[PDB]
Design a protein around this ligand. Sequence first.
Ligand SMILES: [Ca+2]
Ligand SMILES: [Ca+2]
Ligand SMILES: [Ca+2]
Ligand SMILES: [Ca+2]
Ligand SMILES: [Ca+2]
Ligand SMILES: [Ca+2]
Lengths: 196, 196, 196, 196, 196, 196
Amino acid sequence: GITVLTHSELSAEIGVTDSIVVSSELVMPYTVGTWLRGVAANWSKYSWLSVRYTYIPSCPSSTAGSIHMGFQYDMADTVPVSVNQLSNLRGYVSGQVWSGSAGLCFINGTRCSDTSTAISTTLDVSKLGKKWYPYKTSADYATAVGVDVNIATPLVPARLVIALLDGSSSTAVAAGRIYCTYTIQMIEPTASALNN
Amino acid sequence: GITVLTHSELSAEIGVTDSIVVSSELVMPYTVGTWLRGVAANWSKYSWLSVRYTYIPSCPSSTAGSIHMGFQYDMADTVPVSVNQLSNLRGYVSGQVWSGSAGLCFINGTRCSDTSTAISTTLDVSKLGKKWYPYKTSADYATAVGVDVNIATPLVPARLVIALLDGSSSTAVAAGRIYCTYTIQMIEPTASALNN
Amino acid sequence: GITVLTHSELSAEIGVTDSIVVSSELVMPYTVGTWLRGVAANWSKYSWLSVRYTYIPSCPSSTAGSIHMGFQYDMADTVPVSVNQLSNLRGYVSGQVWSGSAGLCFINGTRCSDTSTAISTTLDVSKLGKKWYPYKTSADYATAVGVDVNIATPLVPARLVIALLDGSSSTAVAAGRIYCTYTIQMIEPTASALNN
Amino acid sequence: GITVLTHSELSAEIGVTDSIVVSSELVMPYTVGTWLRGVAANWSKYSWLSVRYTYIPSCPSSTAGSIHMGFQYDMADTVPVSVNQLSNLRGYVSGQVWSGSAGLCFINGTRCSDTSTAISTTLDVSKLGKKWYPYKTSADYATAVGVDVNIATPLVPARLVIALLDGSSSTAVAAGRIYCTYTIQMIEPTASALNN
Amino acid sequence: GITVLTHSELSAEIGVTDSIVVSSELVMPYTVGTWLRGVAANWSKYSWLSVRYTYIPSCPSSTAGSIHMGFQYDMADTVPVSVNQLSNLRGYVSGQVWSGSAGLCFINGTRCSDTSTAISTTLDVSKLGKKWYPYKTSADYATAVGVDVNIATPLVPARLVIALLDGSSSTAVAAGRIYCTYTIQMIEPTASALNN
Amino acid sequence: GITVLTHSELSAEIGVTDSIVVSSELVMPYTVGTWLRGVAANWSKYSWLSVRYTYIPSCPSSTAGSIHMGFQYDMADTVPVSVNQLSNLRGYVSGQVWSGSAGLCFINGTRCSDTSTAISTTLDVSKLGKKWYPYKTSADYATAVGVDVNIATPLVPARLVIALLDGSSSTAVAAGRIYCTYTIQMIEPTASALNN
Ligand SMILES: [Ca+2]
Ligand SMILES: [Ca+2]
Ligand SMILES: [Ca+2]
Ligand SMILES: [Ca+2]
Ligand SMILES: [Ca+2]
Ligand SMILES: [Ca+2]
């Protein structure tokens, strides 16, 4: 009763400043993107066969700045505050805010060789707490972690932390965007209106 | 250290009215029936190798009404309120309140062919959040979900929702009953008095 | 880039009167049911690997009436007005309004033998005009056929005509319902908001 | 009676501004380019064995801006209005307005490895409504969709939507151009003067 | 559920004048002949496994005139106005108004060798827009193309254009006739009275 | 990305009195010992390939007293209060407070035969709720179970309960100590300062 789906989609718009800015995003259907959010809601649970966040630039080669990404798995753990700490994470990747074009290969689904430069990273998937996670909505998840953060580990597999710095302006400069490419298995359908 | 057991037992008495009535039952040792409840309490955790709820009629062929069953896996999800929504669920089955005799085959354990008409449904089991669940008691479970519903996913694999309607009276008419047939693996024994 | 999905869902509620009543439903994602309607909208086109409408009773064995189903493929063709005409159609099935329980086998997905009595019918699929059809919405389709019915053949594969008669009352009596079981291939994803 | 032809040709000139600009082009012989337009007109119908739109830059590495491409198949569907929506489409590709040189490989017909960075995308072809489409002219097509958009699905296989933004000027800056590389099968010759 | 049928039948009476006269006939069950018209109406859709129009003479060897035939596939395309244009068409054949006797071989169904002289032509069949077409009636088809010609491509596979000239009189002289030999697959039966 | 490590370490000092004293310890990296606590903190999650608690004596053969050990898996379950209840647990072991020297074999890592007398016990490991658990700190864990005990099952695999009695004094007499020998798989590194 598995419905397998492979798709790429926009995940976040990216900008750079001269001071470091750290952020994180949950790695669950509801938050990766608007498309998958609407689709996955029609199923009770899901499993990540593959999830990869890849950064694609949209700025001039003269643009100052660098982007950093990595994964965390215990939402209770505190979020990195420096490139140093972030570099220790699983799947850590780093690159110039104007580099990463080679990552298109993964999004397009096409097969390619020159990937060395790609600012793209993939999830363990096989090392996650469990295989089948329940589809959650921000609101519901929010309330849960509101009671206690640990209530989250059985609700979400991991979070992607991002850091942007080395920019030339104190005012964000659009650098590019992060796309999410995934192969998800969705099971146990439900009327979407009932899925919290 | 596994103790495997296969047994059938009464789960619920069923009645029909002219207005739809939706209910749900947790799919855990403690709530499937009085027998298994007492037995499983002597073990710390368990796993469902097979769990099937099957409806058996006890009324005349002239009895008005229909029965509906399906599964949900995220206790946080809201319970169906209409046959339409319920029909989307995994393992959805529907039938006349006086049909379903063929389901006896499964309960009796005997091998049979003419199952088409059986108002019986089985759990994914292999698609549950995890394999080994802790034996819980209503009280303990109740308190947990009282704090937050999501605390439930790591405590119970699924819930069986039931709907009854199309009856001819506004006053429930005994139609039949739901029996649970299961093959459960029980592990890590404990003095029952300590199992919450 | 195919996303295959197999699912059963409620399609229509059925009632009987003493005078014949003929109706028809388009066999496209948008109209088979509310669930698939929402899901399929996220893809540009689709293909039916299998589509079957099966009637399940919910009334007493004493209920008067019979149900009739068949398929038509040229929306320009006029709809049958008598059981006689309807009996000529592809996939024609007929049965007592209280029979058809055996059809549950198909919905449940389970394997069964005693299907003889099932008031269920399946689509040619391999004999449809084409394989890949565009996802359409009632409104859009309506406007198209408003200009000319033939504009419909490249938009929808077929329609299911239904007839109900032999009832004992002039006022509809709830007899049962038609469920749709399908295996659909969905391709070329799109933001649902853009799908007309 | 098939006449197979493989050729690359200029499809569109591209410019960038600081505000998003979305456009689309039909994927049929008449509109891909002036060359194929004149050639294909000598045949009644055709089939796409392969069609790929690839973007080639002509600006400095310092040029601000990004280009976006994807496919739609139901001309009745509304055109994307944001990068987000566009990213959901089949064959979606994105890149800096000054990147994409690697795509030359495809145009030249030569065999190459370092394609990762290529801002190029190819059509399903095997998932199109049908295989053989009639050669149409803008005028004729225009009149048809004027009556009703759906009259288009049996006349054209798909449309390529394009989006340009992230530029530094409100006045378009020439960034590069889109070339179309195709392998088309042309059948049933006709005097070109008669082909509408 | 396919009903295959092979049959020959009269399609049109032919006459010649000293000025060219061009005409065309749709290649669909309803218009090839009175016999097939009545038969095919009992089925919803059909497919041409083989369709051949063959001219048989009935005049003296001294009769002046020549006959010309060819196929067109986009009803929107304008009809040829000269032998020159017509000669470009698929399946173009030409011959003296008193020649063509050898074509009898095809009609009779018998096997023959001396076919060189036969004024007979066959349809691509495998290169048609689609395989299964809906049975249409002149009236319905007429109304459709009345709205827009293109609505026709999904309703009919092709048209046979005919040209007659080189006659010795300005008043038509009976030369012979065109017979249609076909192998058609008919599917999805329907009461003929409902087939439009 | 797995870092496997096998090591033995001191877990607890043991003393005996004439009245029974029951205690328990969580079976997670942070609490087994000071060494592993510091090491494992550098990784996000871990898995127990093998965990064994073994008691080693340090008293005279004349020392009165006995030691008892067993495992529990649902932290919500109440802790045993008598040897009788404790004897029902998984991995229950019992022995004289001055026996158990043979257990050294396991700690030393060396291979040995005369293990009969060893007061040592090992964890199911394969029957735990899940395989990969998040590294937790006492404080964080404490707060979680403070909200609700059940929040613990997805944070810790099991607890080791210990009982000491049959001593000759009401004042604890140092009997020996419990060492923990484990083979742990650590994954997804993190800066230790961030691990809660
Ligand atoms: Ca949910
Ligand atoms: Ca318990
Ligand atoms: Ca659409
Ligand atoms: Ca044309
Ligand atoms: Ca028709
Ligand atoms: Ca942690």
